[PDB]
Structures are given as C-alpha cells and as structure tokens.
C-alpha cells in the first residue's frame, strides 16, 4: 500500500 493513512 503506497498511501498508508490519508495520502
């Protein structure tokens, strides 16, 4: 997963 949280 490139963007872990919100970005």
């Amino acid at each position: 997963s490139t963007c872990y949280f919100i970005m």
Partner: antibody
C-alpha cells in the same frame, strides 16, 4: 519526536533546476507511510505535487505544468523535490509532510531574474 | 480532476458562537474500501496547515470535540460548536480518494465588529 524540516535555495532564476530537501527526524521514511510535497501560492491555493512510498515508488500530480520528480536518500532519512526548469509561476511556499498528519515549517521559493 | 468548492470565502463569527463551513465536491468521494477520504485542515497565520478532521468525521489527535465533520455524496460540512480565538485562520477541505489529491480554496474564519 516525528518532525520535518524543508530546506532549499530560496531564490533561483527562471530556467534553473532545483532541489528542496526534507530532513525527517524521529520516524523512518522506510516505515509504512508515504511522504508528500505540497505547494501554496499567494491567494492561499494549496497544490499537492506528489509522494514517495516507504518502498521508494512515486506518485505525482499528472495535471501540473511544472516539470518535477521526487527522490529520497534513506541513509540520510531525507526525501527531495527536484524542480526542473522553473518559471516565475513556481514562486510560493513548499511544504513537506508525511501524510498530512505531520508537516514542516515550509520553505519560500522565489523564481525571479 | 476533482474540484472542491468552499462556501463561504470569508466567515465572520463572534467568539463563543457556532460556525459552519461547507465544501462541495464535483465527484463522489467514496473509495473502493468504503471510506470517504474528505478531510479538513486549519492554517493559522505564519504556520503550515494542520489536520483537524479526516476520513469525513474522525477528529485528529489533540483536536477538541467542538470540531465535527459531516457529509454525504458531494455536500460536506465542518461545524465548530463554540468558536475560540485559536480557531481563527483558513479552513481547507481536502479530498484524497482520487489522484490527484485536491483542496478547496479555503474559508477565512474572521471576527465580527
């Protein structure tokens, strides 16, 4: 202890190329999170430029006219915004962030001849 | 790209009063995983934007319960129940469901006289 600090030239001439450095302390840029670059112009417009994954892969804003790329140096715990052949329209504040949760102070870039 | 439109551009409020900022999206912001990546940031003068609400209604760490995020479809809202002097600055809606990530133009929360 998670902190970010932008650094760069401050003033460049139109057509020159450029690196802005974001030094990260307290957290490793190889852990989970993406690391983002976001610009702000006078008038308050915020513009997301892109990110570099914890695994070194990039994702850019495809709609921008500025020529740029994002790189990193894991051993120095730093990620960079390479601005290529800048124009007067690239003048503004450049923020690094992790994923909008932690941000640096921002760096002012002026492009003038 | 996704266009985010903020209303109003300037919000004159009295300290202690309730305040509400609206954000209109050009697209639905429901991700494949079911989450709505619509967030709210606050930028105080001389500072970087700070995350208040995220994934539509979650309060970020340290953010008081006076701030709440609401919305569905293309209409999203941020409510401040009791405005304090600390709440003054520019409020931005942010969407990160679709790449490129985009922001609204900002809403200035100002004082009434």
């Amino acid at each position: 202890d998670v902190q970010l600090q932008e650094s760069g030239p401050g003033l460049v001439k139109p057509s020159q190329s450029l690196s802005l450095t974001c030094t990260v302390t307290g957290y490793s840029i190889t852990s989970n999170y993406a690391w983002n670059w976001i610009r702000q112009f006078p008038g308050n417009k915020l513009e997301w430029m892109g990110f570099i994954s914890s695994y070194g892969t990039t994702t850019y804003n495809p709609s921008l006219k500025s020529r740029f790329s994002i790189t990193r140096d894991t051993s120095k715990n730093q990620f960079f915004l390479q601005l290529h052949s800048v124009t007067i329209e690239d003048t503004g504040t450049y923020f690094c962030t992790r994923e909008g949760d932690y941000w640096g102070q921002g760096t002012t870039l002026t492009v003038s001849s | 790209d996704v266009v985010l439109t903020q209303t109003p551009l300037s919000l004159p409020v009295s300290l202690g009063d309730q305040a509400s900022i609206s954000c209109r999206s050009s697209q639905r912001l429901v991700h494949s995983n079911g989450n709505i990546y619509l967030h709210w940031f606050l930028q105080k003068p001389g500072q970087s934007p700070k995350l208040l609400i995220y994934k539509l209604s979650s309060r970020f760490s340290g953010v008081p319960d006076r701030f709440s995020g609401s919305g569905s479809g293309t209409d999203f809202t941020l409510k401040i129940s009791r405005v304090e002097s600390e709440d003054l600055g520019i409020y931005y809606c942010s969407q990160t469901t679709h790449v490129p990530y985009t922001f609204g133009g900002g809403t200035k929360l100002e004082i009434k006289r």
